[PDB]
Subunit: 291 residues, 6 copies
């Protein structure tokens, strides 16, 4: 029952994703292919990252993560292939995933395959890694790769060999740490008592606002559930509510709820209504909070 | 070969669905996960209900329907699970689905699991049920659930256990009928011989206007195939046409067809052209039909 | 363990595709269903052609291609089922797909089933065929096909039967060639050394511009990589760049690239930036190339 | 104390109209300049015609009408200047404008100056003319007319001269009739007792729908106030109402009104609500009327 | 030097306003016609009101105010004609208009002519009145009024007679107070210390937000210049700034300024940037303030 | 016959302009008020400057130009007033305006009054000046000005006094040159023989693209009428065309014209079709031109 979780920027409007899928079923007949999603803002390693980092704990051990935006397609760049260390708890409390106490996942049990363009930056910081190879072997990639379609040549295809039990260390030479491209995560800055950060995501389709202030940033400024907070966005729009577990706590439909999202981050929303869209709020806007 | 049929309001823009699925594969390795749709209007129970009500006859026996919009996530609210009675024929006519004379489905052959928020109103109505349980049990749901993701935790996780043969009656206590939340279906009123309903839906991607006026309503208003009909939408836009079985019956491309859809409800369209988009006709406008 | 590749115009916003999937698993329990796409401009056979013609080389032998837009749903028309001849190499060079030198594919190995309305013009033109049959037999279509849903009834259902091993030849009588509807393909003309075409397509979600000026057309005015081209779009927009394999080749982000796409056609784009979106370029605009 | 009525396509977003106004006050210091409108769809002579043809009855005798869209600005074309014959009654009944029984207007009393490009087709057709002259004399146009600004040079400037008393006959040689460009006016056809036209216009800012089915056309299939009409728009939209003088006559706010507009043409609207805006109705759509 | 200030809902895209203007110049040759504006949301007596109430003090004594939205056009309704009592100070301080100490305007010096549909409600409350007549005399209105164009028949035309020195009391019978239609102004409600009201206007094109909380509501809750205020809109969006005279006081460009507008009302804005549009704020949204 | 030429950013949606005008008529009863435009981009000095710089030659002698965007309203900032020196020829060529050989204007014949915010940068440049005064005096401005309406109080009111013959030198103290705020005009740089400017404006309503590249720049780049030009906008969209005097010179409707506008700046358009709107070309994009 080998599984591939597939995340790309290819979209769902044409056959691009189907092609990789065919090659996946062709290379590894027992495989199950799981779409993560294919709508990510193209060439955006940063937004890509957030769609792939929280996945491991949800998935059966042995799962192979094919994750690709490939703006450097057709050049001499080459994919990176890594077994991650810690499967890693997550959520708003930090716990394993599933029924009961959740399923605990053994160490070193997932492999990510991706452009070496910093797509994995956060996956690496949060899960760490056991081993890292450059994807070069003609047994796992095409001899004559489609110049403009490396997401399929250099990620979808070798991912399937990986699903079909190809020895990881045979994909190419070991990559050393400095050789794995990284993107810079900007930090939560202090400023008085207030923690200062940014809107990381509009949580579609609900229109919820996610921020890059983690609970750890919060529960280290001594902010916990129950505190009246002032959250200011775009520099100009203040908001006031207690930090609550979820949306129905804000009371009436339309009320403002400040919560920790399912990925562990400070968030703000309207209770059963969209916050972002009516006010046209967006990713990258400033976001400051204080008790 | 267990089937989970999954209908959510999670959208396909991020990994929300993939996290559910991965856990589905974790709990039930042999399962097949089929996406119904994932794009329904957020928190819109009535809408969610149309995408799920019609499915049973189409699926093999023992299929689990994971159907979910969860605006009460994080509350002490618990899910509901039901084995439905009649799989029920459908379409414009009232026939079983499939090749030849259609395949019949044994009774008591499909389990719905959903928020107990009224999402199953029309399923329960159209299908009846044999049993119904509150989903409280720590063997099928998490001990500490993510307060913002009850679609994952109270729907996605349980359904995989049920697909994998977890006894339905052991998920929690027997709910009675009154404990199963309903929304009441606004009924087709009547002025003279005219019938007064609503645009229940715009049929994407085609722009076909679906009304809440069912075959049964037309029968015993005396309205059969070939009756010349005057139908008015939004109280402003009239259309005159005989009731035909299909679009091409209109004649010239772009002509008005009045018809019964693959669900058996009164509908209007242009033939091989889009009706609702040029006219910006939306869900919920009044729908009136005289002969 | 057979595969159906499913392409329609049904959208992913309601339960329609799912319904087909349900019957596919119902008739052929061991099938894997692979979504090609379901977002094609409705009733646009030429567009639907694009999303299916390149598929066969990517799928294992025995894959069944279920391809459908049915404006004539509810009429006396019946689908056509065909065994293609050549699997066809493809892409920019014209080569097998896969790792190594690629998965060479045997002849006579894929079946397409489709409305008989020219959806398979391209597929035939490019792959040839071995046999063709009218899909009529009630062993593979309903005796009472739902008038408005021929894509489920006359394509999905019989695809499932074929996939499971229903012999192709038993679907109904064989079709003589002139009975297979084709649409006209506007050809690439010549003017001086220039080539005159159209914008076949916008490459979503990126915004690349696709033409119907194939490499064979190019390789017949002598045009290869590194040639200083002038590509005029919409009759008023000269573009001037070398023909290059990939986007990075243009240098700086946002620069103009003239390349051959993964399908083998002359195209134009910007290096890691959108060409079509800011300037609202569209399918059907004039396309001209010369050195 | 003379008046120039100024209609152009120049917009009101820059200093362009002002520039003309400046020269008007410069050459004829005592002029009053009256803005007709300057928002007409650029280069659309038929549209520009609408905004000028009804003017003369509303203005004192001696008013000069400066009317201009000049796509041919910078060429050898020269404006035409004409003294209209009949001032023309107008409106729904056909009557003089003003208090009491209205300001009866003497014949030969208004001058139009315009590009010779059919802008005055309607005005001539409906008012006749007494004399016509090519505007050439350097006493009334620049010796070096700004190539791209003929509306200022070949219309505004000479309008100012005429207004001040420059004799019409001295502007240049007289034009024979065939030298006065007209565009074709599609006429109102007949079918049974029905009348077949178009939507001449959207009545901004309200959203009333205007047709080219005049009252004379109506008064020739015998159609008067109180007649039960069926007005079909865009070929698929029957509308059914009596012909009535004003909007209130339809009863409730939002109801459908069929009336004769202030220009004398059959129109359709809603009582104190917009018809055209919600349903995106447009100029050029088919219009048909019958009792 | 008689002046007419003209306010309507007729728009600037067609010749409608020109027509009234011609009749105005025809009836009263010495008149100067001053457009107030013609873009007011059609049929909106409430929004109309705000465009006409502050005008008197700006204008030469004797000025006649023609102000019209006429949704009851063509019925037996008839305009109202009134000399207002107090010219009335205004602004944010309350003062006469102009250089020095401004120009003080004698009492009973302006006349408004308008539909009797409550257009004048606020003009009457704020300026009071000396005398009021119904506009019925055929010497000042047409004998056969254009049914759909009463703004010109029943306002523009008699306004000009009024400008030309027609005795006011000769327009028709005296109207008694109850006979002048009024619209209801909703009040500023108290709620703790906070005054509760509503967004009356987006101040176009700057995108400023105006409210219906007057200074008098403020300077009676003891709120003056210098107080830190909390202004909440749409129920959800709080704002915090001191009440300041103008926008540059907010400091940086983009900063929030809470001010008294030029009409004397509590307002909020960004300093040299739009507040309303980026957040899509609008008229009629709730607005609450507290010190 | 005093003329006030009035250019504001007040817009024509409300009565802001009418309040200015009414005071203008109050102070100077014989004045004629001519609207330049009122719709310029709010607070945009550079833009405001293009609508005002070109006007002098067009107007009679002694015309006062009220020109105003006032983002510093309410500050201690005071207006500036200037008698300009040269009225200055213009257009593509450098000619006086009007019929025959154009009318010449005496020097020192027009007064600008404006915020001293740089709005008069290009007026002062193009015209020079003889005198310049800070507008501080309580005989021409209010003793207590409305803090939000300095366009009315520091521009509209003064200008009417100046129209009515209030001695220019008595409005306040003599400002010197350095006290007159300027914005520096971004200059046409140069790469090889190519010229690098900006889209200075989109010419509404036509969609004509105006660049900052002036005739003088083209002369002594050696570029004259009939030179074959390659012009690139936004660094992406090239256009090739000979320099022609006007649009019709392009040939077929819709063809590319490269030309000099009624202001003498390099420009590009389609012939009698719109260039900027289909392509969404906006003000401020790079403008490059090689021969
Ligand atoms: N225009 C473009 N420039 C650079 N990279 C691009 C591009 N359009 C698409 N891509 C990348 C993005 C896809 O993930 C990759 C698959 F091969 O190709
Ligand atoms: N803004 C919101 N208010 C209330 N409930 C919300 C919400 N955004 C999302 N949800 C609910 C609805 C989703 O189906 C559920 C997933 F478990 O979380
Ligand atoms: N409005 C329409 N007119 C003609 N054909 C239509 C239509 N809307 C959908 N269809 C076709 C296209 C779908 O694939 C098929 C269902 F089988 O029905
Ligand atoms: N792009 C254009 N092509 C042809 N004619 C145009 C044009 N833009 C504006 N015009 C015409 C229309 C204007 O009224 C006239 C100025 F006198 O110039
Ligand atoms: N559709 C309409 N219903 C009611 N009144 C309307 C209307 N369209 C325009 N009007 C009114 C609005 C105009 O002010 C008035 C001028 F006569 O006519
Ligand atoms: N939001 C705003 N910020 C700064 N200044 C503003 C503003 N809205 C309007 N103004 C200025 C600009 C106007 O021209 C001036 C009128 F006197 O008031
Ligand atoms: C807030 S509804 C659940 C889905 C959401 N995208 C999440 O990650 O939690
Ligand atoms: C009417 S076209 C077929 C698909 C459609 N959404 C349906 O349910 O019938
Ligand atoms: C240009 S990125 C690769 C996918 C693209 N849609 C293609 O078919 O080639
Ligand atoms: C319908 S309101 C009156 C003005 C309208 N535009 C007309 O010309 O009749
Ligand atoms: C705020 S800028 C000045 C114009 C505005 N509409 C007002 O009434 O004050
Ligand atoms: C080029 S068409 C004439 C009007 C234009 N706005 C100009 O200034 O020239």
């Amino acid at each position: 029952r080998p599984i591939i979780a597939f995340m790309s920027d290819l979209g769902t409007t044409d056959d691009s994703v189907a092609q990789c899928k065919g090659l996946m079923y062709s290379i590894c007949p027992d495989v199950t292919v799981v779409d993560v999603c294919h709508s990510m803002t193209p060439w955006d390693v940063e937004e890509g990252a957030r769609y792939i980092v929280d996945l491991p704990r949800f998935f059966p051990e042995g799962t192979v993560f094919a994750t690709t935006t490939y703006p450097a397609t057709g050049t001499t760049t080459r994919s990176v292939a890594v077994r991650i260390k810690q499967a890693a708890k997550g959520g708003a409390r930090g716990q394993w995933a599933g029924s009961g106490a959740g399923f605990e996942r053994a160490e070193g049990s997932y492999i990510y395959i991706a452009p070496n363009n910093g797509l994995l930056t956060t996956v690496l910081e949060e899960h760490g890694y056991l081993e890292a190879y450059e994807v070069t072997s003609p047994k796992v990639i095409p001899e004559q790769p489609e110049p403009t379609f490396y997401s399929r040549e250099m990620v979808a295809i070798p991912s399937a060999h990986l699903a079909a039990g190809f020895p990881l260390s045979e994909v190419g030479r070991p990559l050393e740490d400095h050789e794995i491209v990284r993107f810079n995560r900007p930090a939560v800055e202090q400023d008085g008592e207030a923690l200062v950060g940014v809107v990381s995501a509009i949580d579609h389709p609900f229109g919820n606002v996610w921020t890059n202030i983690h609970r750890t940033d919060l529960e280290k400024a001594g902010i916990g559930y129950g505190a009246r907070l002032r959250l200011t966005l775009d520099g100009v729009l203040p908001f006031e509510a207690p930090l609550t577990p979820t949306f129905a706590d804000a009371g009436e439909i339309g009320n403002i709820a400040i919560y920790l999202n399912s990925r562990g981050y400070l968030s703000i929303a309207r209770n059963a209504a969209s916050l972002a869209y009516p006010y046209h709020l967006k990713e990258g806007m400033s976001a400051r909070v204080e008790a």
